[PDB]
Write a protein that binds this ligand. Structure first.
Ligand SMILES: [Mg+2]
Ligand SMILES: [Mg+2]
Ligand SMILES: [Mg+2]
Ligand SMILES: [Mg+2]
Ligand SMILES: [Mg+2]
Ligand SMILES: [Mg+2]
Ligand SMILES: [Mg+2]
Ligand SMILES: [Mg+2]
Ligand SMILES: [Mg+2]
Ligand SMILES: [Mg+2]
Ligand SMILES: [Mg+2]
Ligand SMILES: [Mg+2]
Ligand SMILES: [Mg+2]
Ligand SMILES: [Mg+2]
Ligand SMILES: [Mg+2]
Ligand SMILES: [Mg+2]
Ligand SMILES: [Mg+2]
Ligand SMILES: [Mg+2]
Ligand SMILES: [Mg+2]
Ligand SMILES: [Mg+2]
Ligand SMILES: [Mg+2]
Ligand SMILES: [Mg+2]
Ligand SMILES: [Mg+2]
Ligand SMILES: [Mg+2]
Ligand SMILES: [Mg+2]
Ligand SMILES: [Mg+2]
Ligand SMILES: [Mg+2]
Ligand SMILES: [Mg+2]
Ligand SMILES: [Mg+2]
Ligand SMILES: [Mg+2]
Ligand SMILES: [Mg+2]
Ligand SMILES: [Mg+2]
Ligand SMILES: [Mg+2]
Ligand SMILES: [Mg+2]
Lengths: 328, 208, 177, 343, 132
RNA sequence: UUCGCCAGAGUACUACUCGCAACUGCCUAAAACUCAAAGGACUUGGCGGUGCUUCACAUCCACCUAGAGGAGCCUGUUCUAUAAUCGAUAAACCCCGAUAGACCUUACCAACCCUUGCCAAUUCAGCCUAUAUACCGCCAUCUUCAGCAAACCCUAAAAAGGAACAAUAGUAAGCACAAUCAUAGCACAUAAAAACGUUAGGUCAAGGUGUAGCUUAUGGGUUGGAAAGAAAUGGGCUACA
RNA sequence: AUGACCCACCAAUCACA
């Protein structure tokens, strides 16, 4: 299947030249991005599965990694671990154990000479370091693996990293390091806005349950709230809804210090109360300190409420409720 | 369950967040709370940061509700609290200085005391042995006893009133009668305790 | 093991003493065979399932330019070669057993299956091992480190010497014409 | 009514009823049979019974260097064409109703004795055309399954040999009969015995073996006496290359046990050379037809003994009451002397 | 079980097209539509007509090209003209192929009163997506 | 080396004999007749009011909420009833084929009519005639169950079985599950999906068909009729405030 | 507590002259 890959790369280069020509672009500055835009335009397949869409890519990405030829033309296998049926994995383990033996020898010689010169590199935790998944290891060796195989290997790496770390040994166990991406849930503060000689006005947008709310709050005004051009006491006759509007302000002790205007559409009265509650909470985050933002998040003020009406299902009554079931 | 198991419940208390600096283990605890990058459920519409809301009053409100009416049930709760208040003011101004020192005008403490008085100590579970069902005395969990108290209250003041009589009236009546231990609700709790003593031997059938 | 008695010099206070005269007589022939196999350019597999000397053996075979299976032996490995290993394969022309048992103390499958496959087998058969299906058994101790190391070394050297003599007689063959 | 019609595949799938529930549990008989015939088999593009000739289809596009016009055949011409197509149908019906001959192994409906033809070439390119395979026993066997209930697998026992002294048997099992045949062949090649043949016709010496509950007793015959044996044993013998033998089987006649026991007993043979070597003496054969003349068969390579064998006046040997009864003419069985066809 | 437009799993030998290898719940997800026309859009008319036309076209094309039809028809309708795209086995000599191209295009142009285009893509044998 | 026993199963630890402190006894022990098997061990299932663990998440008990069963109506079955359709009819039928019957639809009944009688041609059209136990097509059901299966390999024989991770014979492509896709951002949820088989499950009345039936009729038209509530019951709607 | 009887595996193709 090698001649296949050679050919596929030839015809990929030729075809990339052709595509660069018809699209009217420089064949040299053509990227995979541009190829993607090009075929997206030329063959526009709406299909919801993205792997079923038209693709021209480099044959190495398209085709799966191949296990190379395991023996010479005389029949003698290249690797000495061949007959294990896993040569890659058991090679990996052989070398890992070889280096653990090396660390033990070297560190024992340094125990006899009265020297512990090493340090523990085992905590990478601020880097967000983790081990490979079984999938990654499987891809690295170009060989299928078992859960107990991966677990064995990882445990042996834990044995290695728990000892004094050499340079070559550190570099070795760091192939098998991955770094988990950024973990911070800190919000993104709306930059405060100054408009037409008026000072300190912030905006926020809540969405709850068919109801959308856009809230503009002024920190320069006294306490009142105008929802869709009318007073909040008029728009929300129910006490519960006014308490919902009162929640974030009472939470921040801002109850008299801010003046708000709102546009809320759709849903019912309580859905609107909630949307405005959320919008208001997200709007008051520009005026407050970075700690009280975390306090509002931990009171559940800043999170949208995912709870939404479920679709009725055929053969049932209420999307949960079922028709009366007769035994006999 | 539109929330994954990852989502923690919100802590609505303002006093907790306002005065952190005096406690080490709790500082460490809510440090681990937010710094864990922990998702938080959106705070409920029923629950507020309000200094005026009693969770027990809210539970009883819910337990009164028929259909989807929070409005009508909150209405009847409000009216019952107001009715207890004014009943105790009417009892206050017709009394003398001693009984003006004694009588309680807080409808909240009357609610909580009536329910504490009306909650059962012990209970009955049916158990199948030898092809017969025996009623057996079972110690109850707290929440179960609170529930039983409230449900017994609403059961009686729904069922036993005359149709002319309004709900806040009957409910305030029974709240003030159960405050003083003389209500039919406490008679029900007593029927339970007497049926729990009549069967006391059968307490051996309980295996837990 | 009952079949081990002709190889025993005797029992000293409950411990079994292997006769080393016979051990030498056998090991001679075993090494002889092993070298002759390496000379004729054929595959030698070191099989042991013992986890002490696993690394040592893998090391030994890597250093002779020979192959080692020290791991869990997959079921159809020798019998069904083409599926486990690949489309067509060569199989080891000799198999060396440093331990004739598996860690549950039964005979290593590869003995029965190398027999099954018409492959000759050299192995170190301890006092409790079964010699029957092994082609060139060498009676001796497989448990203690100096014994295992001695045999590792011995087979290493026999292999290396064989391959070298092959190289040199080849050079002589090329200078002949 | 045009939209109310369908594909031929759909129609055949419908009419044949192969996928039904009657086929699976064997809820219907095997003597009931109907087949699918292609209706496009003998038809050409453009042909119709109206008789038209189209320039691109029925007839060549250009006749005499010009373009042929759309035309129609004469009435009688179309009569002859339809006669031809009818005779084509009758020809294929004549071909279809003729059943190919199946060579019978032992009985008409038995698979035993039947040849499967040379086994399949190994993965290395190794090919045996010198090997023939015979079926010993085919048997329908069942297992109770959680879902399916009774589940029927065929298992066949098959033997192979080159006639040159190498032979072996194996068993194979599958849901389909064909599959099991294949499996059993290819597996049989792997287990082969070498059976030593004295003078390449008989065995070396009299054998008697009890394998499990089966008793095989084989006596070594002279040159002219062909293969007097249980039919299975005759088969295996023709595969080994043993041309002259007598074998009686007693006890359980169960096939597998019979061939395992047989191959064991033939494998346990002791060659005159092995005997010569273990006794260190000359083994010397006395033909009755050649008289007192002492033909020396085997000589003990290595050092011959100067010590004569101890002479036992009366030997101690286990004797079969059957052989003794035979020797003294007390076997009167009407079944024993019967004339049979050739080996 | 759902039997709709499904090719059941055989003993594992059964050759299958990309088309037949995907059940009805995979339309618009993996496999696309075998017909393209406006009539099924929100504000549009004469879906019924386009449908009956479609059916007759499949039946007709199947009968006119016996045995050489590889995959199900692709019917594209653009501004009164229909382009029929077909995958065809190599069976007939190109003479017959062109004969039937012209004959069909003409015949259906005169039957449906609109211009009919016919595009034949020839393939050596049925393209196999699965099993086999 | 001996002795005692044993010649298909039942009939039969029986009938008749001899002997016996036994008299409803023991001992000895047949045949007619009946059958084509009777037996012994095993294998894989299934099952068990068998035991031990672990569970159930609308789910069994404990427990929560709202209903049904009683009333009136609405609608469907069952019966009874008519000259007067059919189909479903434990779970997996019962506002079910029907997202739909005043005529039509319509297949039924009663009268009447028409016999190359829809088509380019056809000693042919046409059939809602029988068979869903001949079927294709669609499905139900186990089932949000985790298995099915080709090709090999192993077993002092193999009916079948085939794991032990400090690993003892199993490799396996494929299909399901899983993953992706949808519900316009994630996540969750929901939808969709769910193999092989099981219930000769449902449907010849969607249509198509095998086999067997009708042909001035079991086919094609027109007109008008299809009632009804003794009773029983399912599912609903409206209530009893 | 109960639940007529009867149910199952013994036949081989296609294509060409
Ligand atoms: Mg509902
Ligand atoms: Mg040992
Ligand atoms: Mg015959
Ligand atoms: Mg008898
Ligand atoms: Mg007795
Ligand atoms: Mg008697
Ligand atoms: Mg007698
Ligand atoms: Mg329930
Ligand atoms: Mg109701
Ligand atoms: Mg009711
Ligand atoms: Mg009712
Ligand atoms: Mg009906
Ligand atoms: Mg019918
Ligand atoms: Mg019926
Ligand atoms: Mg049913
Ligand atoms: Mg009518
Ligand atoms: Mg009719
Ligand atoms: Mg059916
Ligand atoms: Mg699986
Ligand atoms: Mg066995
Ligand atoms: Mg198996
Ligand atoms: Mg597989
Ligand atoms: Mg998605
Ligand atoms: Mg999900
Ligand atoms: Mg679903
Ligand atoms: Mg899925
Ligand atoms: Mg049925
Ligand atoms: Mg029926
Ligand atoms: Mg019909
Ligand atoms: Mg009418
Ligand atoms: Mg009713
Ligand atoms: Mg219903
Ligand atoms: Mg009875
Ligand atoms: Mg029964």
């Amino acid at each position: 299947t090698v001649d296949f890959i050679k050919k596929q790369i030839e015809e990929f280069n030729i075809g990339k030249r052709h595509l660069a020509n018809m699209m009217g672009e420089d064949p040299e500055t053509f990227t995979q991005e541009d190829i993607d835009r090009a075929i997206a335009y030329l063959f526009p397949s709406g299909l919801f599965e993205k792997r079923a869409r038209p693709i021209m890519k480099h044959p190495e990405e398209i085709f799966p990694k191949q296990r190379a030829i395991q023996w010479g033309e005389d029949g003698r296998p290249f690797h000495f671990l061949f007959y294990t049926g896993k040569q890659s994995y058991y090679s990996l383990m052989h070398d890992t154990y070889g280096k653990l033996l090396d660390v033990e020898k070297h560190h024992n010689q340094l125990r006899a000479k009265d020297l512990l010169a090493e340090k523990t590199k085992i905590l990478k935790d601020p880097i967000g370091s983790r081990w490979l998944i079984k999938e990654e290891l499987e891809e690295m060796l170009v060989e299928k693996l078992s859960d107990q195989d991966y677990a064995q290997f990882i445990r042996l790496l834990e044995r290695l990293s728990a000892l004094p770390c050499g340079a070559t040994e550190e570099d070795f166990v760091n192939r098998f390091r991955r770094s988990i991406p950024i973990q911070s849930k800190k919000q993104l503060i709306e930059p405060l806005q100054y408009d037409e000689q008026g000072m300190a006005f912030s905006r926020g947008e809540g969405k709850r349950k068919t109801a959308k709310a856009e809230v503009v709050v002024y920190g320069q005004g006294s306490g009142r709230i105008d929802v869709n051009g009318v007073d909040y006491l008029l728009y929300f006759p129910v006490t519960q809804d006014r308490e919902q509007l009162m929640f974030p302000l009472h939470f921040l002790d801002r109850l008299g210090k801010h003046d708000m205007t709102c546009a809320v559409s759709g849903g019912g009265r309580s859905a609107q109360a909630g949307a405005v509650r959320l919008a208001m909470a997200r709007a008051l985050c520009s005026f407050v300190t970075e700690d009280e933002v975390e306090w509002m998040r931990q009171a559940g003020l800043l999170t949208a409420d995912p709870r939404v009406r479920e679709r009725k299902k055929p053969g049932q009554e209420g999307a949960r409720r079922k028709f009366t079931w007769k035994k006999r | 369950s539109r929330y994954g198991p990852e989502y923690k419940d919100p802590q609505i208390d303002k006093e907790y967040y306002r005065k952190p600096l005096a406690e080490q283990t709790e500082e460490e605890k809510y440090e681990r709370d937010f710094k864990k990058t922990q998702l938080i459920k959106a705070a409920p519409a029923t629950k507020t940061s309000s200094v005026f809301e009693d969770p027990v009053i809210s539970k009883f409100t819910n337990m009164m509700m028929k259909g989807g009416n929070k409005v009508l049930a909150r209405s009847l709760m409000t009216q019952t609290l107001e009715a207890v208040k004014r009943k105790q003011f009417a009892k206050y101004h017709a009394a003398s200085a001693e009984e003006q020192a004694t009588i309680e005008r807080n409808p909240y403490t009357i609610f909580h005391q009536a329910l504490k008085n009306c909650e059962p100590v012990i209970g009955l579970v049916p158990i199948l042995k030898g092809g017969h069902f025996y009623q057996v005395p079972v110690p109850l969990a707290d929440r179960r006893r609170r529930f039983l108290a409230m449900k017994w209250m609403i059961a009686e003041c729904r069922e036993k009133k005359h149709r002319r009589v309004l709900m806040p009236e009957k409910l305030s009546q029974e709240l003030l009668e159960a405050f003083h231990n003389q209500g039919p609700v406490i008679k029900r709790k007593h029927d339970m305790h007497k049926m729990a003593e009549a069967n006391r031997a059968l307490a051996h059938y309980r295996w837990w | 093991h009952r079949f081990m008695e002709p190889y025993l010099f005797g029992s000293r206070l409950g411990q079994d003493i292997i006769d080393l005269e016979q051990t030498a007589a056998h090991l001679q022939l075993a090494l002889n065979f092993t070298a002759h196999v390496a000379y004729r350019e054929g595959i030698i597999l070191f099989v042991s399932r013992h986890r002490q000397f696993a690394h040592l053996i893998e090391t030994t075979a890597r250093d002779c330019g020979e192959y080692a299976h020290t791991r869990y032996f997959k079921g159809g490995l020798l019998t069904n070669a083409p599926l486990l290993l690949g489309p067509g394969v060569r199989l080891p022309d000799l198999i060396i057993f440093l331990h004739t048992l598996n860690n549950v103390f039964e005979p290593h499958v590869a003995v029965r299956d190398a027999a099954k496959m018409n492959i000759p087998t050299v192995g170190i058969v301890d006092t409790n091992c079964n010699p029957a299906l092994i082609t060139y058994p060498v009676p001796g101790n497989d448990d203690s480190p100096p014994a295992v190391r001695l045999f590792c070394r011995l087979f290493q050297v026999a292999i290396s010497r064989a391959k070298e003599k092959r190289r040199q007689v080849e050079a002589l063959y090329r200078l002949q014409g | 009514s045009f939209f109310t019609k369908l594909t031929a595949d759909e129609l055949w799938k419908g009419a044949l009823a192969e996928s039904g529930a009657g086929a699976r549990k064997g809820r219907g008989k095997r003597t009931k049979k109907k087949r699918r015939k292609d209706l496009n088999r003998g038809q050409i593009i453009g042909e119709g019974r109206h008789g038209f000739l189209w320039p691109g289809l029925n007839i060549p596009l250009m006749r005499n260097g010009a373009v042929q016009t759309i035309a129609q055949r004469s009435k009688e011409d179309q009569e002859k064409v339809e006669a031809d197509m009818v005779q084509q149908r009758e020809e294929w019906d004549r071909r279809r109703k003729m059943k190919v001959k199946r060579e019978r192994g032992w009985s008409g409906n038995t698979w035993g004795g039947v040849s499967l033809g040379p086994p399949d070439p190994g993965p290395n390119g190794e090919t045996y055309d010198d090997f023939d395979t015979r079926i010993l026993e085919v048997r329908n066997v069942f297992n109770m399954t959680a879902k399916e209930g009774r589940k029927r697998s065929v298992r066949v026992l098959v033997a192979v040999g080159n006639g040159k002294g190498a032979a072996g048997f194996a068993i194979g099992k599958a849901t389909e009969r064909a599959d099991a045949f294949r499996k059993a062949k290819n597996r049989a090649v792997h287990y082969l015995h070498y059976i030593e043949r004295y003078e390449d016709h008989t065995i070396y010496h009299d054998i008697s073996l009890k394998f499990k509950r089966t008793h095989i007793k084989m006596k070594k015959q002279p040159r002219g006496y062909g293969l007097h044996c249980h039919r299975a044993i005759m088969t295996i013998c023709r595969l080994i290359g043993i041309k002259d033998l007598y074998a009686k089987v007693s006890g359980s006649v169960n096939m597998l046990n019979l061939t395992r026991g047989l191959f064991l007993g033939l494998s346990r043979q002791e060659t005159h050379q092995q005997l010569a070597d273990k006794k260190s003496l000359h083994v010397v054969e006395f033909r009755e037809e050649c008289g007192p003349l002492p033909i020396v068969v085997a000589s003990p390579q290595g050092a011959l003994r100067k010590d004569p064998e101890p002479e036992d006046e009366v030997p101690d040997i286990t004797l079969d009451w059957e052989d003794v009864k035979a020797a003294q003419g007390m076997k009167r069985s009407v079944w024993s002397g019967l004339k049979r066809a050739a080996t | 079980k759902n039997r709709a437009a499904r090719v059941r799993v055989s003993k594992g030998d059964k050759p299958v097209t990309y088309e037949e290898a995907h059940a009805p719940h995979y339309i618009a997800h993996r496999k696309g539509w075998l017909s393209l026309h406006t009539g099924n859009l929100d504000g549009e008319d004469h879906a019924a007509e386009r449908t009956v036309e479609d059916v007759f076209l499949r039946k007709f094309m199947l009968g006119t090209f016996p045995g050489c039809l590889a995959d199900q028809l692709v019917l594209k309708r653009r501004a009164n003209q229909l382009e029929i795209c077909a995958l065809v086995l190599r069976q007939l000599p190109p003479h017959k192929f062109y004969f039937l191209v012209g004959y069909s295009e003409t015949l259906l142009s005169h039957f449906y009163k609109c211009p009919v285009h016919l595009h034949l893509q020839t393939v050596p044998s049925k393209v196999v997506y699965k099993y086999i």
